[PDB]
Amino acid sequence: EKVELNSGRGIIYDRNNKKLTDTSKSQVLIVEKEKLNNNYKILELIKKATKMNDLDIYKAVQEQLTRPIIQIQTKNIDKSMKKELEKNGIMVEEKTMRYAKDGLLSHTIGYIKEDDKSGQSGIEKSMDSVLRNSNEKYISAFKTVDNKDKDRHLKTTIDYNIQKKLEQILNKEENPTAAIISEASTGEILAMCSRPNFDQNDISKSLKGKNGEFENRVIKATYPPGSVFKMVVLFSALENGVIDENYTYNCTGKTKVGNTNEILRCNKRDGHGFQNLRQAFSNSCNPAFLDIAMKLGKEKILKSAEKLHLFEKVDIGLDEEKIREAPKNISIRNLAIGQENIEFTPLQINQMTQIIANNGTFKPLYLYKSLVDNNMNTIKTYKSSKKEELISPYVCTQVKEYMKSVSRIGTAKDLKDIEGGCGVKTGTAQSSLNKKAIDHGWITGFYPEERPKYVITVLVEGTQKGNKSATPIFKEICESIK
Ligand SMILES: [Zn+2]
């Protein structure tokens, strides 16, 4: 009879060699079933040591009815109680559970089947071929446990501390959210969080749940970009030479859509007035961006989107990434305002923001660094399949400069005062939950303003109870990682 001291799977580590699985030490008390069932001394000895009761014990007994030896999960058995129990034929072993109670990085890590130990989602499934039976710790019963030179573990790009801070923040939001933080200069993913959460230790209780408790909204959920798309129209316009830094537009609060008497109102309604490019972008002025879009056309804007990696998978090492194809036909109006049949995951928006933030040096977003041994020595390097590109660096630097204005005297002025500044673009997605008009809140940008280290993307889903801005959560993130 085999006693499992761990899941047998390769540990998952963060970028700094801190464990993200296999963190909480616990105990497995092992007793012969006949001895337990026929001898009140042994029952009452186990009860004392575990602090369990008869119901807890005989639940365990009933689950292992057929086995000649019974294994009880417990903890905090000191040394006297340990030798004591061994005098009574009861051996106690130090064990490691796969997932803490903390449950950091749930959707990204995923979960395993308990019989099989096989990966069912996230990293556990995408990297099951290298992690399964790569770290086997077990004893044989009716009475090896320690390291082996061929043990393999997976080291990721995640920063445990940044991940913790982000989960603290999204845990205070009742609305479903998606948040990703990546390194501007390398594309390494420092943190990813989706809400609502699931319990990796209780796949049953969550599966009955109704709100996508198992959806990685960062990599799977697509949303309309709203004004976030003005990064692309602004990029497209400056790259195609249709506008320059000297563009002025007079927002009177409305405009005719091309040649028709179809009318697009501004959000100000009484108008922004005379705007330079910085103000048109900062004010998120729909009429100014229709004016800019009309000068480009559908195809130049889509090619610009394609060039910024919005019409392909980011391919970060997780296979369940979903995307939505470029629309067959869409009105230049819906392009300008970023609504209808154009949608992106937060992962894609983050990748696009990485390029702008990094002055056109595209670093493909990725989650894995290496497969390591028990000494944390590199056995092999992992990296993106994607080729590095230098993309319109000058244009990228212009969009990036204008994004520093949005934070200071724009739609996201509440960020004017954060230590070190930031560059952002906010936006609102228009969806439907039931047939009610529901609004999802976007913000994307980089922190700090001057030499960005972080590319940050947040999406707060609307609910029947109402819609929310992403700006507050972006602010808390920046305040918690200064
Ligand atoms: Zn306007």
Residue numbers in the entry: 55 to 197, 216 to 554
Authors' account:
Next, we determined the structures of PBP3 and SpoVD, at 2.40 Å and 2.20 Å resolution. Both SpoVD and PBP3 possess a canonical class B PBP fold that closely resembles Pseudomonas aeruginosa and E. coli PBP329,30. Like PBP2, the four residues in the Zn2+-binding motif of C. difficile PBP3 and SpoVD consist of an invariant His, a Cys from the X residue of the SXN motif, and two electron rich residues—in this case Cys instead of Asp. The significance of the Asp → Cys substitution between SpoVD/PBP3 and PBP2 is unclear. Whereas the redox-sensitive cysteine in the SXN motif for PBP2 can potentially function as a sensor for environmental oxygen levels, the replacement of Asp for Cys in both sporulation specific PBPs (PBP3 and SpoVD) may further enhance the sensitivity and/or subject them to additional regulation. Subsequent biochemical analysis of purified PBP1, PBP2, and PBP3 demonstrate PBP1 and PBP2 are selectively insensitive to most cephalosporins, in contrast to the non-essential PBP3 which is potently inhibited by all β-lactams. Nonetheless, SpoVD and PBP3 are very promising drug targets.
These drugs achieve their bactericidal potency by irreversibly inhibiting penicillin-binding proteins (PBPs), particularly the transpeptidase (TPase) PBPs that cross-link cell wall peptidoglycan. Remarkably, in addition to C. difficile PBP2, we find this Zn2+-binding motif is also present in C. difficile PBP3 and SpoVD, meaning three of the four TPase PBPs, and all three class B PBPs in C. difficile have this motif.
